[PDB]
Amino acid sequence: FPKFSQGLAQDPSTRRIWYGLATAHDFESHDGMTEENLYQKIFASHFGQLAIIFLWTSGNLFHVAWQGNFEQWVTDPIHVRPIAHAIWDPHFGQPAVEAFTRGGASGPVNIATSGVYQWWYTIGLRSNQELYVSSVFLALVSAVFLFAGWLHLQPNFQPSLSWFKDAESRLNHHLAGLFGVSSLAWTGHLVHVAIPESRGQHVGWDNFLSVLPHPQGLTPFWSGNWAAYAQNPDTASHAFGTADGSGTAILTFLGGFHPQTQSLWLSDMAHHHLAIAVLFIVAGHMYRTNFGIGHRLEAILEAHTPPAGGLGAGHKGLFHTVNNSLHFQLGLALASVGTITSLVAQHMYSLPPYAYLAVDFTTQASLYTHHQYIAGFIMCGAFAHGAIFFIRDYDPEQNKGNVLARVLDHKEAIISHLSWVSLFLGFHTLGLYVHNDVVQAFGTPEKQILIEPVFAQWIQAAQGKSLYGFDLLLASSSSPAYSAGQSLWLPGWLEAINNNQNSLFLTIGPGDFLVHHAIALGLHTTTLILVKGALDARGSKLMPDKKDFGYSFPCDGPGRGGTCDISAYDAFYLAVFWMLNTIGWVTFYWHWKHLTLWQGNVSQFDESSTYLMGWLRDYLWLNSSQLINGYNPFGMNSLSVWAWTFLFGHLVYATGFMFLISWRGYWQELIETLVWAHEKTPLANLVYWKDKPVALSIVQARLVGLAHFSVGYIFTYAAFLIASTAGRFG
Amino acid sequence: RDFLWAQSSQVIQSYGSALSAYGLMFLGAHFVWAFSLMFLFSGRGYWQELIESIVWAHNKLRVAPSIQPRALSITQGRAVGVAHYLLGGIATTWSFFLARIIAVG
Amino acid sequence: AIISHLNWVSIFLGFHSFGLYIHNDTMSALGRPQDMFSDTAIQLQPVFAQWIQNTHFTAPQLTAPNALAATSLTWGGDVVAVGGKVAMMPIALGTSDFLVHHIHA
Amino acid sequence: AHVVKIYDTCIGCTQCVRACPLDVLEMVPWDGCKAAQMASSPRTEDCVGCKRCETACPTDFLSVRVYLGNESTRSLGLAY
Amino acid sequence: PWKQPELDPDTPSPIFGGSTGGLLRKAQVEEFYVITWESPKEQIFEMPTGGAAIMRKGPNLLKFARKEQCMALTTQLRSKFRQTPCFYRVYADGKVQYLHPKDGVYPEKVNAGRVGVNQNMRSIGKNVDPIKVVKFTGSEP
Amino acid sequence: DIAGLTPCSESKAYNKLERKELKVLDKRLKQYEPGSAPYLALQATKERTENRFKTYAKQGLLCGNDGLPHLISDPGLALRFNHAGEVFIPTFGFLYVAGYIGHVGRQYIILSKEDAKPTDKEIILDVPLALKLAFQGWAWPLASIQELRNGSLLEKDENITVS
Amino acid sequence: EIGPKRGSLVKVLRPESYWYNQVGKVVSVDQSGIRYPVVVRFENQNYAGVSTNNYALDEIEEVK
Ligand code: CLA
Ligand code: CLA
């Protein structure tokens, strides 16, 4: 069936069906391709992913409004549990519907874990009608994008190649309009709508023109008295819904958290997205586009060449390399987006931006793991899509003497100095945990090697934490950094950081020390596997010409001692195991340190996280009690769905071990035996396949087994994370 | 639940008693098991290239072996896997059982 | 013919043996314990082994008259206690022992 | 439907020809070497991709390379 | 050779009871291969598919479904018994093709009639990068 | 003190941990007779345990709220507050030993490669030569800087590359 | 004489080779117009197990 590739269609086996799906959206290798048709097919496809996003969001709104309890949750956000979607499974029994109907709703339901209730409530949504109206809005926006992907593919409305390779115009329009004006409008929403909705005022499309956000109006804005909007901020004794304790401010720099809702002040976030709009609009007017003024991108890169020659030619020749290579542009985007995705995880748990999110313990966990596991998957793609650049879109003669060739020249030094750091952290970190495992075991818990992370405690003292007693500049009243920002942010900031009941700059001990170093083992060795597959993508001593074969090929044969798993695809393949291991350590450390905080017994983590039996005893074995009893022989609770899923992941994980351990040659001889039986059987022989059956290829099995591996790695932990935290409710 | 989670209480709580050796072997048996997965899942090709970048540094300092370093053969990596695999899988029971049963119930 | 006919048996067993365990898990999580395979349930009892236990237990009477007792107490009889602990006592076979003995095959 | 290309460094060892089971390779005269022989790949339609040919070439780097590609019934080694 | 030997489809076969490694439905539909040779006495030899069989003094003939099954037998006869086999390819339409000693001389020996094919006049490596041929097929050709 | 850590002498949990670990032995000591060998073994363990706790307190260690001693790594705070023996000084005790092993193995490699059949010298060592170098390596830092300042430490682009 | 002397050591300059920027003894040289006449022998084996290979005039240079 593949029309884009005639080589696979002539294949008689089932390899046609499998390879037809995997090479579907790889437009470069297609038959009869052109550089101009490539960009157009991408531009149309990128409209599609938007259509699924806006529809996916519309489905959550509808399924929440129709089946949820958003109206009931706002009145008592703390005690009431949110509801994601209802359940209709006719294979249930009567005990299950009685258990799964825990919500106020009539029938059984699923409790939500995303946190959309806390988000929608904060921006001024207080009814189910307003969600129905919104679900229609995005479904319209979704259909508009589908119409555009088809429209902008037609004979007319078909952009030329020069239009795509206009970088200076894209930056100015995207930095100013997509980022800035969007951030400016969001401030327009928080001011005109949300802050009133917090202070009791109901603002909507009916009355947003008549209602003023501020009593004075815009006359301060023109006069220059811009401090009038920060005069009467909201008091501490302020309920988030009612006008009790309210103020008139719309832009303020209070800092810290709101007392009742342990969250950031809305007036601050309104002030935040305003300043971001100004810098991004200013940055948008930088590059040159159809007018005399402006910078040029190529002129800059050619200029930043150091005179002495530490970088040789420098950044010359790179503009045509980046602008013409799509894989280069994709590697930088993923590496940037994958890092941002980790910031969203690290900066939300410490600085809750939404109302009544700090109290929802189950919701904070999933949001952290969800983004971090995505941050790993994305970041493993940047190197992978960065390795494809060296094979397909790299020209050495054009990029001669520049930074990119000078890196590739001495790659033996990079890969080697990396291997030292992975080995160093690996021996010495494990040796200490094992030194503490043993010496605990012989009854002497005082002989442990507990090293205090002084450098991090030095920061928290330099950022307001008076526990450690270092007495740094911002922990000292006499310093200027305390004097500056004393009227602005410090009274609200110092109160929060010194409070030891929030996740803002938690206390650190020697147990937190070993893990931050064990995390370093993951990043430095995961980078090693991916960096190697990139730099050695063009050639190795074992295979001087990898570039002629491709990114993904099985091997070069048993000759030269063996050539299994050399290709750059096989490096990405091995890194995902380390990506999951690294994120697992990062995520295990978040959950347990927070459980001890929520349970009140912080001493559990500090004393037991120094040796590895504590992780197996106190974290895994202990918190898997309520979960494992989801379906007992006596009865069943509401956590039965999670225990079922908990095994479901312990199984999928094991099925991948087949495709990983057992390789093709055992199976193809086996399928030849079943083929003999199907023909020699008296009646079944009348039936005959249209496509010949063969075993899965080599590269396919590494992919398939990794999917069965990773899915069990995720479905297992998601059940444990939600069940452990939900059953205890703390 | 009733076999693994339950009967593992005697092994896990063995620290500070005469059965402490079984608590350590219970863990070390897991390490050697997982350690085998590097050999079964991977292949000789990635490792022989990595050694080349390591030989460069050992060569740069004029400290290199006349016996050239070579990655393990294919059949050896498979044998090394099942060995460290079975050893870690079997030694775990050997610790899970004797600690459970010596501390009767 | 050997490998083909033997391939079918493994598939037949892994479905009808291990699939029975998943059926019991799914029935329990859904709140339908009456539909499981168990003693209070859709019993699959090993009648053949049960008949062999009694035959070897009632052997001293008829088939081995000079034998004062049976070969072991696992077939049937009374408990033998030593030091307040039981050395051996009759083992009863039920629905669970059916599934496990078939999982081994 | 695989591709087999032989390069200028052949020396006429014939070890590639002896190793291929499917008779893809044969020897042709040439003036470049001492042995006055060179390989050839007339019938790659019967190629299978065993890479025993590459295993036997004693050069520093191979005078024979099998570049895998589109598959077929003969290439997949299907008796059925 | 001097001339291609045409196929004699009616020659005695070895003494072999039969096995399950024989021909399948692919043979009647697509193609199959047959091998001929001439032995001086009655001997025993290992078949590629199955077990042992007894040759016959004079011409012998087999039918196989793969070319590798045939050439696997030539390597056994040329080495053990020092014979000169020759095998063909038969399609479903009845067409016949003479394959392996296509020049009469085995491929490991030179002959003046042969012409080179797929011969690059360069060193391994020393060839253009894929970027130069980014939008059509082939860096090696 | 520093980092909100109390010294181990003044801590209560530190002494609590001592009274606990001794109570286990005293209970275990009740079973056996006074003059038996199991009694002598446990009394020695009691003597060692009492010595372990007092020596760690005497050494100016820092114990946390859990009651276990903590180590400090920055040489500035270590030297300022008299905690240098913990981490900072053993750093130089190791590196002297580790470089000893490198300077020795590097010399055996170079010298055997100046002769015929160096492969045999690796599997079948020249023990007289190995002991000679092993007792000549007491001053390896001198030879290193001698070899660096001279330039005979590193090789110069006579190494294999891959592209 | 066309090329380097018998028994003379030379340094290789093929980027593809396992012996690149490495030294080996010249075993023989053919003077019949062959493209790759210079036969060289090294002590260290390659990945396959071969310790000899015919190189060209331009591909070899003087030692060190
Ligand atoms: C006081 C004199 C002075 C100094 C100190 C500098 C310094 C510098 N100039 Mg400069 N310059 C000067 C005068 C000076 N300039 C004058 C008079 C002119 C004429 C106008 C210029 C014009 C000029 C240009 C046009 C450019 C520079 C650039 C640079 C920078 C990089 C140059 C270089 O070789 O990279 C150092 C060389 C290397 C090879 C880098 C080594 C990388 C290390 C080894 C990697 C380690 C990574 C590893 C992960 C580390 C661990 C991290 C872990 C802890 C996380 C550097 C900061 C460049 C620049 O702006 O780039 C920033 C540049 O393009 N200079
Ligand atoms: C628990 C399992 C496990 C362990 C311990 C390792 C360990 C290692 N892997 Mg690995 N790996 C694993 C699973 C594991 N992997 C899996 C499942 C995969 C997916 C296929 C990979 C894929 C993978 C890749 C792709 C790479 C690694 C790399 C590494 C090394 C990283 C450097 C380092 O920190 O070494 C130090 C850390 C240690 C834990 C050392 C182990 C030795 C300790 C000290 C015990 C010492 C022995 C002791 C004296 C007793 C011996 C007696 C006995 C002989 C009788 C290290 C050897 C990287 C590498 O080698 O780069 C250098 C690399 O590129 N691995």
Ligand code: CLA
């Ligand atoms: C902006 C994001 C983005 C974009 C636009 C692309 C675009 C592309 N990538 Mg890339 N990639 C990305 C992110 C992105 N990637 C990330 C984040 C990674 C790291 C994981 C990769 C890793 C990657 C590799 C390793 C490769 C590509 C390839 C490709 C090319 C298309 C291949 C194709 O059609 O496969 C279509 C493939 C499929 C349809 C199969 C996907 C099936 C998945 C794995 C199964 C998922 C599990 C299952 C559904 C779970 C269900 C749960 C169950 C319980 C119900 C194309 C240029 C390929 C390429 O360029 O080849 C030269 C290639 O080899 N990418």
Ligand code: CLA
């Ligand atoms: C003002 C004019 C303007 C605007 C608004 C856009 C807008 C866009 N262009 Mg675009 N473009 C323009 C002019 C403009 N263009 C011009 C002049 C040209 C020719 C030079 C192009 C050529 C062009 C191409 C060739 C392509 C685009 C594409 C896109 C889309 C990017 C994908 C996306 O949704 O990112 C959305 C991004 C944001 C909304 C903001 C940035 C997001 C970061 C991560 C910040 C996150 C902030 C915050 C934390 C988020 C919180 C979320 C909250 C819900 C919790 C986007 C809709 C792509 C496309 O067609 O996609 C379909 C594409 O391929 N543009």
Ligand code: CLA
């Ligand atoms: C938990 C992991 C796991 C599982 C489930 C299997 C499963 C299997 N392996 Mg296996 N294997 C594994 C790990 C695993 N392997 C590992 C790690 C290795 C490496 C040593 C191997 C090595 C290996 C070899 C070497 C061989 C097998 C064989 C087999 C098969 C035996 C036939 C049988 O009983 O299947 C019957 C089916 C099951 C056991 C599935 C159980 C679950 C239920 C019944 C399925 C329910 C289906 C559901 C109702 C339909 C849903 C449809 C949905 C789309 C709507 C079977 C497919 C043999 C084989 O294939 O030849 C016969 C064989 O020779 N495996």
Ligand code: CLA
């Ligand atoms: C004495 C011999 C010797 C020397 C001087 C070096 C020197 C070096 N090695 Mg190396 N290495 C050696 C032997 C040696 N190696 C052996 C035998 C192996 C195989 C296990 C390795 C495997 C190895 C790896 C995998 C790596 C290094 C790396 C390095 C560099 C950084 C130091 C490091 O990470 O140590 C690490 C040291 C080890 C992991 C173990 C070394 C084994 C013992 C302790 C020393 C050997 C002593 C020898 C048997 C005694 C002979 C004495 C004679 C008189 C009889 C450095 C250039 C790193 C690199 O790439 O450079 C940046 C790196 O990642 N080494």
Ligand SMILES: CC1=C(/C=C/C(C)=C/C=C/C(C)=C/C=C/C=C(C)/C=C/C=C(C)/C=C/C2=C(C)CCCC2(C)C)C(C)(C)CCC1
């Ligand atoms: C291979 C390759 C690739 C890839 C790449 C990658 C993926 C990268 C990575 C990298 C990364 C991903 C990076 C990262 C970065 C980051 C950083 C570097 C940052 C830092 C920051 C800073 C600088 C800050 C500072 C500060 C401030 C500002 C304030 C506070 C304090 C502090 C100090 C913190 C590409 C595609 C190109 C292509 C070629 C090949």
Ligand SMILES: CC1=C(C/C=C(\C)CCC[C@H](C)CCC[C@H](C)CCCC(C)C)C(=O)c2ccccc2C1=O
């Ligand atoms: C079992 C096995 C096979 C044979 C497995 C086969 C033939 C199973 C694939 C066919 C079945 C019928 C598909 C089963 C349906 C899936 C559960 C769902 C697929 C969903 C997709 C359509 C998306 C290999 O070919 C193989 C190759 C290389 C390494 C390891 C192995 C390996 O382990």
Ligand SMILES: CC1=C(C/C=C(\C)CCC[C@H](C)CCC[C@H](C)CCCC(C)C)C(=O)c2ccccc2C1=O
């Ligand atoms: C890791 C790995 C390697 C590399 C492994 C190697 C080179 C073996 C390393 C053996 C070391 C040298 C043994 C010695 C280890 C310690 C130094 C012993 C401790 C000694 C101290 C106590 C002194 C392969 O070659 C390989 C090949 C095929 C499939 C998988 C793999 C594979 O997984």
Ligand code: SF4
């Ligand atoms: S194997 Fe290679 S070097 Fe030897 S004759 Fe054939 S092509 Fe020439």
